[PDB]
Structures are given as structure tokens and as C-alpha cells.
């Protein structure tokens, strides 16, 4: 059972995008299964993750359909990932023959083949290894420190459902016609205390 | 063994420039960055500033900014330090120290492994 | 100047055990980042001991053990012997100054 509220009443991060639903409602449905994927970009490139737009990012690395159905939540990190010196353990795809299908990776690191002279297992000339690097440094600008982004997926659509929103109860009373709830049964009438023994 | 030697202190009178550097030997140079650390006399060590793996980023404390700039020659596994118009604050023995390999959590914490044996440097007249 | 605040001197004899306390600021140590541990001789470069919360280093006795909580650390020397007269630095990372911060060293005397 899953709990949004919370999430959205953080008031930490910057960027809270739903489509196809509104983060208000979120807590009065249910889904099936749902997908969670995290990465780390550039603050510049936190644009590209959205449906139907075009760069580096969204055509090489991380790809979203244009029927996409999920919320987008970004965040600044800048204390986190950035060392004085600079940091080089974070990377990305820049160069490739095909864009990618939504909601694919690749992680083959074969030499590009750049202009027509042919290469195999050799950087020297019109042959790039694909994978750059980032540099990450404290003191960057504001559109150069990292960010963190995490996207979520939801179907809405057959099975058994199985990740719910956070129904919750209230108190009871007794000897007067109220409005009982009780699980999936409903119904009106008059609750009262009885010796009957339920098996169990 | 991992070892560094540096040379290049001496006496000088104030205003004065100077340079020194150290060369390190038994592991690959180019793969780490490296720090410079002062050590005043009889005081707690201080940093100084830091030069990336191929000397195309790199960072310097408030203190000294302005009068110390640092270089790499990555052929010749050796890294330079200059300081231009010392002041009577200056006087300290400089390590140059090695960035840590493997630092476990979080990408931001740093530390130092091994370490050189230090220069004396002092401004008078 | 040390940032990070440290006892000035520690004594002890051989036997027992002695400990010394490094404390820092809410941005230093109370930001999440880690705790490090130098020793140095006298006469001599300082010299990796305690590398992260614990987790010491090769060429190193066990006698020497630390940890970190809240927003200070605490080395602990086992079975003090009356080699260990050096000094004792504690270092860490600062996300506001922007600078890797030192400690003002502990003098620690073995009777």
C-alpha cells in the first residue's frame, strides 16, 4: 500500500510533473504494478524528460512514450554528488546510429563508426568511444549541478489489483442508526453488542 | 612502493616567488588527482588546493586564491605548485598528497593515503 | 584554524584504554559525510590510520578503533602500549565552506 501525501507535502523537490492524473487524487485508486527508475543529469537536460521532446538525453539514453501515463520528480543535488577536483563516475551516451524505443537501455560500449574509413578496437581517428563523462564540480553554475530524477509508471488497466491507496477508518458507536462501512459491505441499521460465536 | 619525494624550499625575503614541485613513481600517475597540504609549525595541517587527473578542472582554498596557481605534467609524473608574492603566513611544510581510491559512501568525501615528506619553507630577511 | 574541535592532550598508561572525542558543526559531520583518522609520528609525514567510520587500513595494529554518531566522532585506543606517543588528527568535509576541514590534534601521553 502506497503512500503519495507524504511525498507531495515534502515541499523539497522542484519539479512534481503528472500526467494523466493529478497528484491530489492519487490516493483513492488503486494500480497493479508499479515502476520506479532513478538516474542523475545535468540541470540543464531536466527538461528532456518529459513526452515527446528531443536531445541528447531523451534520443540516446532514457526515452518516454507519448501515451505515458506517471509523475516526474526531480530535485536539486548538489551537496551529494559533486566533490572538489571533479567528478567523473557519472556518464552518458553521445554518440549512436538510432534513436531508442521508449522505455529502453543499451549499455554496449563498441567504437562508433564516424566517417567512411572503417575501425575496429582503436580511438585514432573519426572513431569516438561513445560513453562522455560528466564533470561534476561544487562550484559549478546553477544550470550545471547535478539532479536527481525519479519517474514513475502506472497501467490502470486488467489484472487482480494490488498496490493500493491508504484507505483508512474512523471510530464507531452503537444503539443508533448510522451508515456502517464496514469493508465492502455497506448498509444502514443499528449496531449492537451480540453473544454470537463466529467461527474463526 | 608508492613513494613521492618534493624539493624546491628554501629562505626568501618577502615579495618574492617561488616554485616546487614533487615526483611521484610506482602506480599510475594519470589515473588520480592529487592535493597540496601546508602544515604551520607546531599547528593543526590545512589544505591548500587540488588539480583533477588531467588538469583541465581544478580548485583552490580562499585563503591562497589569487597568489597560487598549480600544474600537471602527466609525461613526466610530476606536478607543479607556484606561489607569487609570499607573505609572512607562508612559512609551513607543504605535502603533496594523493586523492583515496575507494571512499565507500556518499561522492563528496575525500582523503588522503599517501603522503610525501614535506619542504621547509620560511619568508625572512 | 581547526574547525573541527579536539581535545588538546590525552594521557594514559599501558594497559587500559583512552578515547578521544572529535566533534564538528551541523554542516561538517552533521551533513552524513564520514570521519578520517591520521597519525603522525614525531619527525615524521602524517600517515593514514583510520580511514571511514572504522574500516582501518592494511599495515595497521586492530588495538585502534573508532566510530562516528550524531554530530562527533570518537577514536578508541585498546591496549595502550607506550609506542602510540604521537599525534592524532581528525579530518572530514565541509559542504558550506567548500574545503576538506582538519582537527587540532591530540597530543596523547602514555605514563
Known amino acids: 500500500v502506497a503512500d503519495y501525501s507524504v511525498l507531495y507535502n515534502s515541499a523539497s523537490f522542484s519539479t512534481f510533473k503528472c500526467y494523466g492524473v493529478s497528484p491530489t487524487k492519487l490516493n483513492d485508486l488503486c494500480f497493479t504494478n508499479v515502476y520506479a527508475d532513478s538516474f542523475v543529469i545535468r540541470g540543464d537536460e531536466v527538461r528532456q524528460i518529459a513526452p515527446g521532446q528531443t536531445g541528447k538525453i531523451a534520443d540516446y539514453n532514457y526515452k518516454l512514450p507519448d501515451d505515458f501515463t506517471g509523475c516526474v520528480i526531480a530535485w536539486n543535488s548538489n551537496n551529494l554528488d559533486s566533490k572538489v577536483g571533479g567528478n567523473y563516475n557519472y556518464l552518458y551516451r553521445l554518440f549512436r546510429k538510432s534513436n531508442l524505443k521508449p522505455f529502453e537501455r543499451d549499455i554496449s560500449t563498441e567504437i562508433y563508426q564516424a566517417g567512411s574509413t572503417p575501425c575496429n578496437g582503436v580511438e585514432g581517428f573519426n572513431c569516438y568511444f561513445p560513453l562522455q563523462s560528466y564533470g561534476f564540480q561544487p562550484t559549478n553554475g546553477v544550470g550545471y549541478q547535478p539532479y536527481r530524477v525519479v519517474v514513475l509508471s502506472f497501467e490502470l488497466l486488467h489484472a487482480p489489483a494490488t498496490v493500493c491507496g491508504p484507505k483508512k477508518s474512523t471510530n464507531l458507536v452503537k444503539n443508533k442508526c448510522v451508515n456502517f462501512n464496514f469493508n465492502g459491505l455497506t448498509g444502514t441499521g443499528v449496531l449492537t453488542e451480540s453473544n454470537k460465536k463466529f467461527l474463526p | 612502493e608508492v613513494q613521492l619525494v618534493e624539493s624546491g624550499g628554501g629562505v626568501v625575503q618577502p615579495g618574492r616567488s617561488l616554485r616546487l614541485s614533487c615526483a611521484a613513481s610506482?602506480?599510475?600517475?594519470?589515473?588520480?588527482?592529487m592535493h597540496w597540504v601546508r602544515q604551520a609549525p607546531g599547528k593543526g595541517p590545512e589544505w591548500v588546493a587540488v588539480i583533477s587527473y588531467d588538469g583541465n578542472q581544478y580548485h583552490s582554498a580562499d585563503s591562497v586564491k589569487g597568489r597560487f596557481t598549480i600544474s600537471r605534467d602527466n609525461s613526466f609524473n610530476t606536478l607543479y605548485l607556484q606561489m607569487n608574492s609570499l607573505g609572512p603566513e607562508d612559512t609551513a611544510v607543504y605535502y603533496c598528497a594523493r586523492d583515496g581510491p575507494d571512499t565507500s559512501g556518499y561522492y563528496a568525501n575525500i582523503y588522503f593515503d599517501f603522503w610525501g615528506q614535506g619542504t621547509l619553507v620560511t619568508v625572512s630577511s | 584554524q581547526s574547525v573541527l574541535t579536539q581535545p588538546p592532550s590525552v594521557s594514559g598508561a599501558p594497559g587500559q584504554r583512552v578515547t578521544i572525542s572529535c566533534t564538528g558543526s551541523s554542516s561538517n559531520i552533521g551533513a552524513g559525510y564520514d570521519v578520517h583518522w591520521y597519525q603522525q609520528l614525531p619527525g615524521r609525514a602524517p600517515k593514514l590510520l583510520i580511514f571511514?567510520?572504522?574500516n582501518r587500513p592494511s599495515g595497521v595494529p586492530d588495538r585502534f578503533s573508532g566510530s562516528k554518531s550524531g554530530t562527533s566522532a570518537s577514536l578508541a585506543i585498546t591496549g595502550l602500549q607506550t609506542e602510540d606517543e604521537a599525534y592524532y588528527y581528525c579530518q572530514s568535509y565541509d559542504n558550506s565552506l567548500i574545503l576538506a576541514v582538519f582537527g587540532g590534534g591530540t597530543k596523547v601521553t602514555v605514563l
Open positions: 610506482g602506480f599510475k600517475f594519470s589515473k588520480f588527482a
Open positions: 571511514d567510520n572504522n
